[PDB]
Design an enzyme around this catalytic site. Structure first.
Site, PDB file in Angstrom:
ATOM      1  CD  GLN F   2      41.219  50.060  39.642  1.00 40.79           C
ATOM      2  OE1 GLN F   2      42.244  50.064  40.345  1.00 40.79           O
ATOM      3  NE2 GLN F   2      40.522  51.175  39.438  1.00 40.79           N
ATOM      4  CD  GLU F   3      41.039  43.390  43.236  1.00 42.35           C
ATOM      5  OE1 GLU F   3      40.465  42.767  44.158  1.00 42.35           O
ATOM      6  OE2 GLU F   3      42.087  42.985  42.683  1.00 42.35           O
ATOM      7  CG  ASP F   4      36.655  40.081  39.957  1.00 45.82           C
ATOM      8  OD1 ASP F   4      36.985  39.889  38.753  1.00 45.82           O
ATOM      9  OD2 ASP F   4      37.158  39.449  40.923  1.00 45.82           O
ATOM     10  CB  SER F   5      32.959  46.405  40.461  1.00 42.03           C
ATOM     11  OG  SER F   5      34.121  47.021  40.992  1.00 42.03           O
TER      12      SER F   5
ATOM     13  CG  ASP I  35      34.204  38.318  43.685  1.00 38.02           C
ATOM     14  OD1 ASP I  35      33.856  38.259  44.895  1.00 38.02           O
ATOM     15  OD2 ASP I  35      35.273  37.828  43.264  1.00 38.02           O
TER      16      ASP I  35
END
Ligand SMILES: [Mg+2]
Ligand SMILES: [Mg+2]
Ligand SMILES: [Zn+2]
Ligand SMILES: [Zn+2]
Lengths: 98, 168, 193, 239, 38, 49, 49, 65, 56
Positions: F2-5, I35
């Site tokens: 989740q959330e870019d990982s 990120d």
């Protein structure tokens, strides 16, 4: 860009020589009230003179440049609307092949 | 104000010489020594001052004194503020302009903004963040390495006494 | 420093830099809490900054061994500057140039600097020639030796130490060398410890 | 090519639209104030209005542009010959000033054309072309040039950058050799070539710029641009 | 007015692969020998 | 993830997926500070250092 | 057991970038200080706060 | 930079299929799809393995000392 | 740190691996994305300061 390259610089001196031998009335003795439409010739931003038949001269220049005889790095533009013919020997100009 | 700020005190006569903690020195390797810009600037004020003193003491040639004066006026001025409009700058051999007292207090990174309103601190850690759907809202996962470096000074009381001994 | 708690002749004490303490390895007692990064401290005097933007670069290095204690600042053209004042102030500094016979003998260094660059010699050689000369020039052991040959002799003294190979005949041609004279001057200086 | 005597000439058109008497002036170098166009033309030997007008405007029937120039003639009315015009320009820096005017116009005015003599006629014609071009945008015939057109932009590469540096560095050496020529002629000490030419000048000089990035002398490394010359990225072949 | 050689001036740094460079006219097998990457 | 990982195959990591070599070069000068002073490469002795 | 949804699955060229966590991780609870300000030093490298 | 022993994803030993692969392409002149299949590389993970290998080792071997 | 919710007090969970692990519903106020973002921890040194943390 990939195809892109930059100018290194040429000697304008021989191009200036071809100009006066292709019908270029020198600026020093130009009479504006006599030829108020004659196309003005520029070499690296220096007004060298004026030309009565600009289209034929341009054709001669281009076919000289495509022959190799005049450097393919040299810029040659005719501004039909502004009655101007500018040329660049100048280095720093970014160019791409077409 | 009659007690703290009189007009006459807007003109300097006696110069407070800051102690070294204000202008640090570093004695490197006996042929390498580092002196603070302010120390350089004070050496210029003094050199200038010593010269004008000799000039006034000896035969005062008027115009030769007012010349020496404006040079002292500069070095003194230039030490407090080097970034003066119109005036040339005090330069350290390198071409680098002298970090004046004004310069040091001045910006964001200046003694006020960068050293008082803000400051780097101890008992602080920073690493990459990752999400954990298994953690609680109010919880934060701490890598063991960080936890093992960061500390809490717990006081010995008859409650924690036995546990603290075990940790020690 | 030495640990009060123990005190065994050789004091086995460690610098735990990352933890910022000076500790007694034997007992564990921290002897100092305040510790400085020397390398990063030195970087405020000597740095990449030539521009003068760096709030860290606040000082300037010097060579006591050669320059002595001469702290000076160029009066120079800044962003806003009327050239009139730069001239005026520098004109003023000229009148205030009433320096001693030895404060004018630093012009003999300017000679060695001009002689090394001409001899294609390194910075270290200059700093050695300027060193040996600064120590022997005033000497009674040297006395009235040919001043032109005394400083040329210190260039070979500098080259010998900095391992930069140069022949006597090379330095001889570089300035002008009276062979017996610049061989005698190179021996009184060599004898001067 | 060579030295690059980067001097700028501005031909300013004064007065906003709907304002009385809109004069045209020029930025001549080493001169305090901007000078009226007619005064410069009269300083170039083009003295009658009819001639000063011809160099600017090619069409006799362009009353629109000619009426635009009427207050320029009126503004330079006081001056009426080369000497009067030259002395005028000089005072803005007698005989002392006439020469100053003669020199500024020949040497520092439109030097890309020529730095000397008989090209007054040529320099003057260009001045007219500039004014013509100025008046065209003012009559809304032609439009203001695009200050971002890439064709009117240049990219100075390794060559030009070094050439720029070397020019300043060679001039540094050339003038240090002159200084030595005086020293050696004073004492007849024989002009030892090794003692004259300091290799270190160019050697360490170029080395500095290339190493630090401050494109100029170390003096100097404060006022000289830094960013030219960077340590080459060797992350990935593409980088 | 009446009447009565080659000097070293400095070291110019060469750009790798230029006319003056040793690697300009160098072959693949050559560069590998020079411990340089083709 | 989740959330870019992102989830990565640990088993692929073992089989050598996305491994990298890292090389760092440390450099030191044995400097000469005039006529007498010289830095020296050696094993320093804790008693006299 | 089958996933109720079908997944968009297949190869995709992916790049392993710089910035690895262990090159970034940084903790400090006291350490070296600045001589001018007497505040902590700057940099993970220098073990600053 | 030498043919990986074993497919990252699945684990089929793939490091013994290199020289054999190159023989099918050069000596036999078969196309990659046809070649990888002869070798027994059924699933796309194992195919991606041989198909995408760049044998840099060969470039490295070219430097003498 | 743009608003008071860019700095909030949390309950420790000493865990393996080099990252600060957090719940996602907490991403919103911090303006965090995983990120390669980094975050900071500050350890109170007083029984008083930890109350300010746990209480407000
Ligand atoms: Mg984010
Ligand atoms: Mg987001
Ligand atoms: Zn102890
Ligand atoms: Zn597989």
């Amino acid at each position: 860009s990939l195809m892109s390259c930059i100018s290194v610089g040429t000697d304008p001196m021989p191009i200036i020589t071809f100009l006066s031998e292709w019908g270029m009335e020198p600026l020093e003795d130009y009479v504006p009230h006599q030829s108020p439409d004659a196309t003005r010739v520029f070499v690296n931003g220096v007004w060298h003179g004026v030309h009565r038949n600009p289209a034929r001269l341009m054709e001669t220049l281009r076919t000289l440049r495509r022959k190799g005889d005049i450097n393919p790095e040299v810029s040659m533009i005719r501004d039909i609307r502004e009655k101007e013919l500018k040329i660049f020997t100048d280095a720093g100009r970014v160019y791409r092949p077409l | 104000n009659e007690v703290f700020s009189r007009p006459e005190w807007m003109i300097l006569t006696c110069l407070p010489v800051p102690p070294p903690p204000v202008r640090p020195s570093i004695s490197f390797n006996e042929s390498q020594r580092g002196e603070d810009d302010l120390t350089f600037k004070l050496a210029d004020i003094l050199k200038a001052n010593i010269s004008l003193e000799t000039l006034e003491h000896n035969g005062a040639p008027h115009h030769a004194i007012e010349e020496a004066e404006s040079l002292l006026q500069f070095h003194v001025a230039t030490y407090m503020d080097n970034d003066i409009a119109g005036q040339p700058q005090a330069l350290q051999k390198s071409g680098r302009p002298v970090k004046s007292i004004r310069a040091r207090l001045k910006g964001k990174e200046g003694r006020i903004r960068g050293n008082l309103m803000g400051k780097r601190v101890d008992f602080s850690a920073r690493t990459v963040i990752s999400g954990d759907p298994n953690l609680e809202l109010d919880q934060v996962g701490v890598p063991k390495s960080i936890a093992k470096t960061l500390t809490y000074p717990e006081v010995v009381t008859p409650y924690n006494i036995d546990r603290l001994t075990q940790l020690v | 420093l030495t640990c009060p708690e123990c005190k065994v002749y050789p004091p086995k004490i460690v610098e735990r830099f990352s933890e910022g303490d000076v500790v007694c390895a034997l007992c564990g007692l921290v002897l100092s809490d305040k510790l400085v990064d020397t390398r990063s401290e030195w970087r405020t005097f000597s740095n990449d900054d030539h521009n003068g933007d760096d709030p860290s670069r606040v000082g300037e290095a010097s060579n006591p061994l050669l320059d002595g204690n001469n702290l000076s600042t160029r009066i120079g053209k800044g962003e806003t500057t009327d050239m009139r004042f730069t001239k005026e102030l520098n004109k003023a500094q000229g009148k205030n140039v009433m320096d001693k016979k030895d404060n004018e003998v630093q012009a003999a260094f300017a000679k060695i600097t001009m002689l090394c660059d001409a001899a294609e010699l390194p910075k270290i050689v200059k700093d050695c020639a300027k060193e040996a000369y600064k120590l022997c020039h005033d000497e009674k052991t040297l006395k009235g030796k040919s001043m032109e040959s005394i400083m040329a002799a210190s260039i070979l003294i500098g080259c010998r130490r900095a391992e930069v190979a140069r022949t006597f005949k090379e330095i001889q041609s570089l300035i002008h060398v009276k062979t017996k004279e610049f061989g005698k001057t190179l021996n009184i200086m060599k004898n001067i410890l | 090519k060579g030295s690059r005597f980067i001097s700028t000439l501005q031909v300013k058109l004064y007065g906003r639209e709907g304002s009385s008497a809109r004069t045209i002036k020029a930025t001549l170098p080493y001169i305090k104030q901007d000078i009226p166009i007619v005064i410069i033309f009269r300083a170039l030997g083009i003295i009658p209005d009819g001639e000063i007008l011809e160099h600017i405007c090619y069409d006799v029937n362009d009353w629109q542009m000619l009426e635009m120039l009427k207050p320029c003639v009126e503004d330079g009315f006081v001056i009426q010959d080369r000497e009067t015009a030259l002395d005028f320009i000089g005072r803005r820096g007698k005989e002392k000033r006439i020469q100053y005017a003669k020199d500024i116009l020949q040497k520092e005015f439109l030097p890309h054309i020529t730095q000397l003599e008989g090209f007054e006629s040529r320099k003057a014609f260009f001045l007219g072309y500039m004014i013509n071009r100025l008046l065209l945008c003012a009559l809304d015939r032609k439009d203001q040039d695009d200050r971002d057109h890439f064709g009117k932009k240049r990219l100075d590469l390794a060559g030009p950058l070094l050439a720029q540096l070397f020019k300043t560095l060679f001039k540094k050496l050339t003038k240090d050799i002159f200084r030595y020529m005086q020293r050696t002629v004073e004492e007849a000490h024989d002009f030892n070539m090794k003692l004259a030419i300091n290799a270190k000048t160019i050697t360490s000089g170029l080395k500095y710029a290339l190493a630090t990035g401050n494109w100029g002398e170390q003096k100097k490394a404060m006022s000289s641009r830094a960013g030219v010359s960077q340590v080459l990225n060797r992350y990935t072949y593409s980088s | 007015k009446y009447e009565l050689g080659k000097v070293f001036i400095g070291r110019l740094p060469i750009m790798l692969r230029s006319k003056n460079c040793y690697l300009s006219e160098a072959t693949e097998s050559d560069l590998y020998k020079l411990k340089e990457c083709p | 993830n989740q959330e870019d990982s992102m989830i990565m195959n640990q088993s692929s990591i073992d089989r050598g997926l996305f491994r990298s070599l890292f090389f760092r070069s440390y450099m030191d000068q044995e400097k000469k500070y005039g006529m007498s002073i010289t830095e020296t490469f050696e094993k320093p002795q804790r008693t006299n250092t | 057991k089958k996933l109720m949804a079908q997944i968009f699955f297949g190869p995709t060229y992916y790049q392993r970038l710089r910035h690895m966590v262990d090159d970034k991780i940084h903790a400090r609870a006291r350490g070296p200080m600045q001589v001018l300000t007497r505040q902590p030093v700057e940099g993970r490298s220098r073990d600053g706060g | 930079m030498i043919v990986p022993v074993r497919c990252f994803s699945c684990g089929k030993v793939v490091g013994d299929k290199w020289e054999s692969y190159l023989n099918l392409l050069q000596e036999d002149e078969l196309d990659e799809g046809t070649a990888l299949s002869r070798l027994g590389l059924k699933r796309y993970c194992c195919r991606r393995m041989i198909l995408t290998h760049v044998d840099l080792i060969e470039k490295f071997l070219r430097y003498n000392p | 740190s743009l608003h008071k919710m860019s700095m909030m007090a949390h309950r420790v969970k000493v865990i393996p691996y080099s990252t600060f692990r957090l719940n996602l519903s907490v991403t919103s106020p911090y303006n965090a994305d995983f990120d390669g973002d980094e975050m900071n921890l500050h350890v109170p040194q007083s029984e008083e300061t930890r109350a300010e943390l746990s209480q407000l």
